Design a protein around this ligand. Sequence first.
Ligand SMILES: CC(C)(COP(=O)(O)OP(=O)(O)OC[C@H]1O[C@@H](n2cnc3c(N)ncnc32)[C@H](O)[C@@H]1OP(=O)(O)O)[C@@H](O)C(=O)NCCC(=O)NCCS
Ligand SMILES: [Mg+2]
Lengths: 307, 393
Amino acid sequence: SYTASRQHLYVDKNTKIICQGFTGKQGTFHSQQALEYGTKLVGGTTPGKGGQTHLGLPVFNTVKEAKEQTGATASVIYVPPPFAAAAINEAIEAEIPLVVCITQGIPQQDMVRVKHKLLRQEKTRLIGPNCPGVINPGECKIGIMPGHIHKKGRIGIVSRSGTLTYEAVHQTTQVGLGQSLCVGIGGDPFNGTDFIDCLEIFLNDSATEGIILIGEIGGNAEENAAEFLKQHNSGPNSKPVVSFIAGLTAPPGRRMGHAGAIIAGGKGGAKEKISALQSAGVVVSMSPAQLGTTIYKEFEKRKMLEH
Amino acid sequence: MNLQEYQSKKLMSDNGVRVQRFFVADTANEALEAAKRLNAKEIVLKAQILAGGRGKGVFNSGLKGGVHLTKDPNVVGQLAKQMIGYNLATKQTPKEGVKVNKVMVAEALDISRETYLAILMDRSCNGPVLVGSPQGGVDIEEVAASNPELIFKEQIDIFEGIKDSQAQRMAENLGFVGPLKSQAADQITKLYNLFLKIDATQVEVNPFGETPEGQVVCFDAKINFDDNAEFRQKDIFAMDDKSENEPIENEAAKYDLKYIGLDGNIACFVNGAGLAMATCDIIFLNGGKPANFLDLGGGVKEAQVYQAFKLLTADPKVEAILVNIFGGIVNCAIIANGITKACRELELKVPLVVRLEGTNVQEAQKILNNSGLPITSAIDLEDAAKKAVASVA
Ligand SMILES: CC(C)(COP(=O)(O)OP(=O)(O)OC[C@H]1O[C@@H](n2cnc3c(N)ncnc32)[C@H](O)[C@@H]1OP(=O)(O)O)[C@@H](O)C(=O)NCCC(=O)NCCS
Ligand SMILES: [Mg+2]
């Protein structure tokens, strides 16, 4: 089933990348940053510009063309909302092992159709849309995250918020722990990767010794992850998990930017997610500035720091 | 966005959904003539405002009640004269109320059974779901806590569409019997196709009722629209009635900005929905009250930054401003240029706390360092919240 593609989240130095929307404003700027970061970006697609050259790399009309000619195993999408669901579907049809969609604003009904296709195959793993991407620090950067805040290390981070991902990375770099793999799953209600998907990778990754899970109001994905952690991360060799849930003070009945982020029909509150995660043994930092220090202290108690 | 009742019921009626026959009237005399054109035993007159509680509202002209029933078109016009042009206040409007420019004049209909029926995009189910209950006329959340056994659902495949089998089964679980069941199922089908046609996130009918004469009618309804589909729903979004939205929020929307006004005195200028929520939260944690939520998103242009910053300096409640940017796709230098341009036209007179990190952070700090503005620098999110709370307390 589609869960068989979870492994494709763990990009590394050997992952080669194409960029859909390569020649647009944002595809160009963040492709430049990826190039400077050392990531193996080998080309991109822009229908109608196949054959051209961009940032010193070939442009193709189609994903299948670009995949065959470059051997890319991942794609990142900087396509505008009216066309981005089609772009995702093209990458799925081309059996790109990993697809990351940065685009904000894809109609929910479009993403319903995209998930229908996605769930009925397992060659392609989707991260997003409306997400920052994924990064294996020092090895492979796929998205918009500022490169210079990362340091390869020991903490796996999964977040529904792009900018809170940067905060969690920055804080774990500061306290010296670093990051093993960072996945932003995005703020949209229909997406390709949830918390449990990333927690499976994290719990089975020896490089990942602790986990930061960042969530927010809306939906039940945090409650689901709590139960998954209850059953799969309760042993004596359990990995510490620290979390922050945004929106404790948010007003009810309002979309807080993210389509996903809404307290509706008395469901989706933050404290309910905090209590659920606490019941699973997760340590919830009340302040979003203290994720790094909170997980450092959890490492200290467990005698996990080198010192 | 929001639609008036007459707009949403027209949209439903033009798509085959059975509603109460009705006219909309801009004047009392038009309402009186509308009442005559209906030629119905009884008539309902309804003030058109978006807020709720119209039943118990009171007009600044003295008329108590926004919904009235009468069998006499003359009473309809008499009542309308006290509604149109007059502000209708209710439990969910400001004490001033809402200027009523239109009233609905519709055929009143006896309700012999009330049910609940909705279609929504369900995140858990990964697509559209029919939700129904024979317990009509009450908050569906109250039915789900008291009698969850009476909440029925069907998962609709997005490519296959609603099947007749699913519409029939939901009609039966709602109590519809015999001929009324085929009516109900065909209305369920039409509501579902409408829901897809208009990029709704939810279409909610309550009561989805029967009349003694054997009609299945959607008596009241609420539609929530997917803002992300505006580019392919121009006609519907043109009808958006912003007359009851908070004014600063309306201003921000003109520039593709998401502003939600709160009750505090510390303004927030943040990128990202998560960081923006977390900034409100960490201000509260440190003893302050945030004045607003603001999600600066994606590829911000300098003009948008400039306009968004001015939304904060014009709120009378703001006593300090907290700028907190962690830029990935957002370019910190564009933030810096937009803020400085806004401050050059203001006296300020409010503390300005600034935390910047991420994309092009270095250039942005130079812009701010050369600007001559009285800025309080912050090293991290906790430092920024503590400095913002201190500056006003
Ligand atoms: C996706 C997004 C970045 C694109 O904006 P942009 O880069 O300013 O847009 P542009 O129009 O400059 O470029 C997009 C390109 O896609 C191309 N394109 C269109 N359809 C395409 C397709 N199916 N496949 C590939 N490229 C396609 C266009 O041709 C255009 O390139 P061109 O100008 O060379 O012709 C923007 O719409 C967006 O979503 N921004 C917000 C992102 C965000 O904040 N996400 C959340 C992060 S947590
Ligand atoms: Mg965002």
